[PDB]
Amino acid sequence: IVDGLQLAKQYGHQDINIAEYWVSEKLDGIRARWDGTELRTRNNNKIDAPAWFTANWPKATIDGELWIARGQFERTASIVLSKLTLPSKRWAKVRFMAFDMPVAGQSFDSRLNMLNNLKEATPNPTFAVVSQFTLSSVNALEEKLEQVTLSGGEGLMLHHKKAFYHSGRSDKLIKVKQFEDAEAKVLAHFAGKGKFKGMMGSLLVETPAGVQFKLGTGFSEKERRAPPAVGSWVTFKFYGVTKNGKPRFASFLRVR
DNA sequence: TTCCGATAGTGGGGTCGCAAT
DNA sequence: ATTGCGACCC
DNA sequence: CACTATCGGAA
Ligand SMILES: *P(=O)(O)OC[C@H]1O[C@@H](n2cnc3c(N)ncnc32)[C@H](O)[C@@H]1O
C-alpha cells in the first residue's frame, strides 16, 4: 500500500539504543514481494515460481527474502531468476523468509505479530518468517555479528519496534555487515565510460594468493586521472568472497 | 552550523537469455 | 556449438 | 551490491 520501499541504512551513519530494535540475521538471498497472487523482485520483475510454491499463501502484500541457507546466494539466484520451462523442481529447498509488510500506519511490532499470525494460518512450509530476537549493548551487537559472520551468515538487520513503515533510509531500519582489508597488485588499466571517458574505469588487480579481479569503485575523480600505475599495490575492502574466491562488493581505499 | 536523505551516475561478481559469431 | 552483450540479482 | 559527487532541508 505504501509507495516506495524502505531501504536499510548502514550502521556507522554510537547513538541508537539497540534495545528499541528487533534484531535478525540478514539472509543472503533474493528480495521478493508477494502480491497475494504473484512474486516480484525489488524492481518488479516477475519471479517465475511453481504454483505449489505459493499454494495457500495469504492474500496480502508481504516482503520477503527467497533463501535456502547461508552461503547459497549464487545458487539461489540461479533458481529464482530463471524462467520455469517435474523438472525445474529446484525450488524444493527454497523458502520465502518474510520480514515485513508494507502496511501504512502501524508499528513493525504489529506487522511482525501479523506475520506470525499468517504463518500459523498457512499450511505451506515454503512460507516462513525471519526469526526476530533482542540484543542489549552495542557490545552484544558486535559479538553477535562476529558469531554470525563466522557461522557463514551475511550480517544483521535492525528494525525499530515502534516505527511505522516509510520509504527511504533512516534509523528505523539499519544494516550491519562486516568487512576486511587486503592488498593486491595492479596489473592493467581499463578505460572508463560515460562521464569517466578518457579516465580510468577499473584496475585489474591480483591478490598475493593469485586471485585476479577488477577493482572499479572507491576512486575519487582525481584518483581516476593519473591512477595507481601498473605494478604498484593497492588496499581494498571487501565483504567476503564468492564461490570462486573473488572479493565481493570490493572498493578501493588507499595505495601502498 | 553540521549532517542527513534523496538523485544521478559510475564500477564490480554472478547469472540468464538472446543476438551475433 | 561459441562467444559476446545487456539486464537483471547482490 | 559497492562507491563518488551534489544538493536542499532536516537536526
Ligand atoms: P542491501 O542488502 O544493502 O539492502 C538490504 C536488503 O537485504 C534484504 N534482507 C535480507 N535479509 C533480511 C532480513 N533478515 N531483514 C531485512 N532485510 C533483509 C532486504 O530485502 C533488503 O533489500
Author numbering: 7 to 19, 22 to 93, 120 to 290
Show sentences the authors wrote.
To further explore the mechanism of Lig E DNA ligases we have carried out site-directed mutagenesis of Psy-Lig and determined the structure of a close homolog from the marine gamma proteobacterium Alteromonas mediterranea Lig E (Ame-Lig) bound to nicked adenylated DNA. The overall structure of the Ame-Lig-DNA complex resolved to 2.3 Å clearly reveals that this Lig E-type ligase binds its substrate without complete encirclement of the DNA duplex. As with other DNA-ligase intermediates, the core catalytic domains of Ame-Lig are oriented to form a C-shaped clamp about the DNA with the nick positioned above the AMP-binding pocket. Inspection of the electron density reveals a phosphodiester bond between the 5′P of the nicked strand and the alpha phosphate of the AMP, indicating that the step two intermediate has been crystalized after transfer of the cofactor from the catalytic lysine K34 to the DNA. DNA encirclement by Ame-Lig encompasses ∼245° of the helix circumference, and the interaction buries 3837 Å2 of contact surface. Continuous electron density is observed for most the protein chain from I7 to R290 with the exception of residues 20–21, and a 26 residue section in the AD domain (S94–S119). The DNA-binding footprint of Ame-Lig is 8 nucleotides (nt29–nt36) on the nicked strand and 12 nucleotides on the complement (nt5–nt16), thus smaller than any previously-described DNA-bound ligase structure. The two terminal base pairs of the nick are distorted into an RNA-like A structure with the sugar moiety adopting a C3′ endo conformation and shortened distances between backbone phosphates, while the remainder of the duplex adopts the preferred DNA-B form. As is the case with other previously-described ligase–DNA intermediates, this distortion is a consequence of two conserved phenylalanines F81 and F283 stacking against the sugars of the 5′PO4 and 3′OH nucleotides.
